[PDB]
Amino acid sequence: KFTGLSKEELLKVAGSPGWVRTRWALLLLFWLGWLGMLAGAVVIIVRAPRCRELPAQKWWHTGALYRIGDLQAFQGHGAGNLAGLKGRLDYLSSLKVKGLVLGPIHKNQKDDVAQTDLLQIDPNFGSKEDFDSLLQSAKKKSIRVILDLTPNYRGENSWFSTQVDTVATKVKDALEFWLQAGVDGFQVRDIENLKDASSFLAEWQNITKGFSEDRLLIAGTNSSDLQQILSLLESNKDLLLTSSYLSDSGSTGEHTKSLVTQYLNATGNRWCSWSLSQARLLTSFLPAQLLRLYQLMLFTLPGTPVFSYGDEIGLDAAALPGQPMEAPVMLWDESSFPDIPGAVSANMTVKGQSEDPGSLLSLFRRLSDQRSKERSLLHGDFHAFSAGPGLFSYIRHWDQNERFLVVLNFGDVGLSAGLQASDLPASASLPAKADLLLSTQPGREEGSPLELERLKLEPHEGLLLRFPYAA
Amino acid sequence: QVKLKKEISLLNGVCLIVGNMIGSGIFVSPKGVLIYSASFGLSLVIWAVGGLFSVFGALCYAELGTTIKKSGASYAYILEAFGGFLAFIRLWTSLLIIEPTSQAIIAITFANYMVQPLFPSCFAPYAASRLLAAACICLLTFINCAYVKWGTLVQDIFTYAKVLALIAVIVAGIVRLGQGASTHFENSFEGSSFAVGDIALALYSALFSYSGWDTLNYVTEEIKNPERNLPLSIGISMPIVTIIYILTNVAYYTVLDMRDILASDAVAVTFADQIFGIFNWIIPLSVALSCFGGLNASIVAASRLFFVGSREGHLPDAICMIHVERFTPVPSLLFNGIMALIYLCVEDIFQLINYYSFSYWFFVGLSIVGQLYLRWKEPDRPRPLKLSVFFPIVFCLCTIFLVAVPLYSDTINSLIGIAIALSGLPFYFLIIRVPEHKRPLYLRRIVGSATRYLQVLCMSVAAE
Ligand SMILES: *[C@@H]1O[C@H](CO)[C@@H](O[C@@H]2O[C@H](CO)[C@@H](O)[C@H](O)[C@H]2NC(C)=O)[C@H](O)[C@H]1NC(C)=O
Ligand SMILES: *[C@@H]1O[C@H](CO)[C@@H](O[C@@H]2O[C@H](CO)[C@@H](O)[C@H](O)[C@H]2NC(C)=O)[C@H](O)[C@H]1NC(C)=O
Ligand SMILES: *[C@@H]1O[C@H](CO)[C@@H](O[C@@H]2O[C@H](CO)[C@@H](O)[C@H](O)[C@H]2NC(C)=O)[C@H](O)[C@H]1NC(C)=O
Ligand SMILES: *[C@@H]1O[C@H](CO)[C@@H](O[C@@H]2O[C@H](CO)[C@@H](O)[C@H](O)[C@H]2NC(C)=O)[C@H](O)[C@H]1NC(C)=O
Ligand SMILES: NC(=[NH2+])NCCC[C@H](N)C(=O)O
Prior knowledge:
Chain A is an alpha/beta fold. Chain A has helices at residues 7-13, 20-45, 72-75, 89-92, 128-140, 165-181, 197-211, 226-231, 253-267, 291-299, 350-353, 360-371, 375-378, and strands at 65-68, 99-102, 106-107, 117-121, 144-148, 185-188, 216-220, 240-242, 272-274, 303-308, 381-385, 391-397, 403-409, 415-416, 433-434, 450-451, 456-457, 462-467.
């Protein structure tokens, strides 16, 4: 009917010369095609170029640091010990900060130079063993502890203005003692009041790097001029140095662009730190309508962002009655300030800002998550390009990863951007359409890809566009 | 006599089940249980519970394989229970979406992890992986078309390779745990998510990882003593995979903390980069060997399924032919390889696993309720081993839970999968349901001529 062949007729018809040659021809053709596709894969593999080697980063290259200068104002009344600080590390890990700068805890009386000792703790903070408990408890949550070792931290002149050699001997012993006890770094402040600054900084940096290479030394100055900042960083180049360099002005955005690009050009794109002060809040220098813009800028510039406590909620020392503005109180809840009761509202607190998805704490938490995981924001290359009158735009790109575009508006007027790039590297040229991660002001929702030619900005707005590696 | 020549021992069956169960899931992504569990100890609990619930289904297929004793592994069982319609729907959806996509995806992951030490964080070239995947598919198709013993030898070698690599990872984790740290396992069950929607999703992710315990039921007519060697090999291969899956995650959690586990593209590569200084390419090479071991078992199971579907009246009878010497089902293997090479040409086929998330567990559960219905209707069949009715009932509830998750969430893709599975009904009512000497003659003459030419080319007759 239509059934197939049996074994006998198949064995008698599939043995003729003409079918045998067809079967051997198809077998040899299949094997040469297999070898051809293997050779094509091998040829394509050795013509894909390369990718560069990671740069083997330290722990302070991977996110922000957090300065807690006054300890008893960080908790409140009574519980201002080193013991009470142990209960805050889950809040600190909510921010994803990689290090912590504990303020000076040693015994200082006043200008008496021979009585202050940098090895022995003032009993108003605790004893020697709950410091050890704090170090281990912070090491479990992946938070490093930096110790401030400024000698005369109770007094107007911060480095004991009469003698210069014995206080350098004090710091030289204290570095060794606390490195053996187990701290992960140091900070010395007000180095413009220290004579022979560049010599002692090199020695202390040497001792700290000689113990281990995952140790840090931070120096702070009140300078704002680039030539002194550069003068302290000639022999030393592994030093993090915090200064008042960006706290001058920025009424116009091209001024801030000039400051950032002039610093990075003058030091040769070395690793730097970005802050507004050596010890002060952002609301000591900026109006409250610029805090989101400056927080987007400080997280997407190539270096280590450094903040004090209360910068993530926008704490203002002049928002309430009398108080030392060098050390305001942190507003955890609405009963955090007992005096002048009822003066603290709910959107001024840590607790009341964690639920609002358009608060300042939420922007800090989103930005500090993106800073510690994206490779083009971890060690990417910075490039700024020209834009409209009053803008600051730049791009961060590493190799073949997701690229980031940041556009910021330091102006009290509406702007259309008009990204006149035309000078970028070929590895980071701009697409026609890019995504969104966030904005500082409401009116947009994120994930929706926007076209970069009629890009319009309302005043005091910053954007976090994003785009993948292509050609 | 041209028949299919039963040559599969106990060790070959153990290596088939272990080499299909252990794949790239234990290597590149044991992350779902941890991201929905948010703790180490609760993750280990979910892994053990998923292993127990997969043992409960493996026992049911041991009983079904010794009762019905025909190859096909759910196709034959649905034929024996609710025959005709539903068996054709299962055969159609596995011919159309299930097996070509899974075989192409396994081949693509093999090609991606062969070239990973040359491209460490680099975004490896696209066209070089498709060519290596096509070469891998064609080589394994040739090896299974030559002899059956060659395929069982390949399965043995690469199963030994992947088990030795996982034993190395486990031993490194155990020596670092007992040596001097033991640090992460002191304050477990902290931050745990004891919600229904999280424990359910963690159990779903852990129960997808134990998939593949039904591979030996596809080749039941090729086992030596199927009343002995099938349940013995299932009962040997289940606790091995469960112990390996628990100890590999213990070794992962000893060395790595939670943050870099949850933010890595492959956990075993991060493990190798952190604990092996040099020879950290051993683990991506081992991942490639594991995918090479899985593709062979997938090819053998799909070819035997299409063979049985051709023998049962569906899927025209050229696919039922057997080579006259070297007794291998050559045109079935050729058809399977052609479909996998066709599905390699589609970019972004990783979307396509969202379309048979509902169907696979639906047909597993349909075979379990067919086992229950045959236990009620025909209680006097010869059963060489029958278990209690506890296991089919609890696995029926487990499969109802397994199909309820892609229907509530991800509900658009499941209806697309149901439409794909129902897209073969014009073939069932217009060709298969109508008998012969009533079908159009010009179709029959064409199919007969093509069958005769393929028969002369492949040197293959139907079974005697
Ligand atoms: C320490 O820094 C100095 C220069 O900043 C380098 O050389 C050392 O110079 C001091 C002089 O004050 C000597 O006491 C040391 O013996 C020098 N170190 C040597 C010769 O190795 C050098 O860059 C740093 N020294 C070390 C050991 O790292
Ligand atoms: C840094 O702080 C000091 C004190 O607040 C500023 O003033 C200097 O004070 C010392 C000691 O009184 C004098 O020796 C200097 O001559 C002072 N400098 C000036 C310019 O008056 C100092 O100006 C601050 N630095 C900056 C950049 O503001
Ligand atoms: C800022 O960067 C530019 C470009 O990288 C450099 O300016 C060059 O400086 C050298 C030396 O003075 C001149 O020969 C070049 O002509 C300058 N470039 C241009 C385009 O004019 C330099 O690295 C930085 N500028 C300064 C003043 O140091
Ligand atoms: C916290 O919320 C209150 C009320 O929403 C804010 O108070 C408003 O402040 C703006 C400008 O400061 C005024 O124009 C409104 O009239 C105020 N409304 C009320 C009801 O007082 C307050 O500014 C918020 N705090 C912060 C830091 O943003
Ligand atoms: N029939 C199957 N789903 N087989 C493979 C299942 C997935 C396998 N357990 C893996 O980790 O790769």
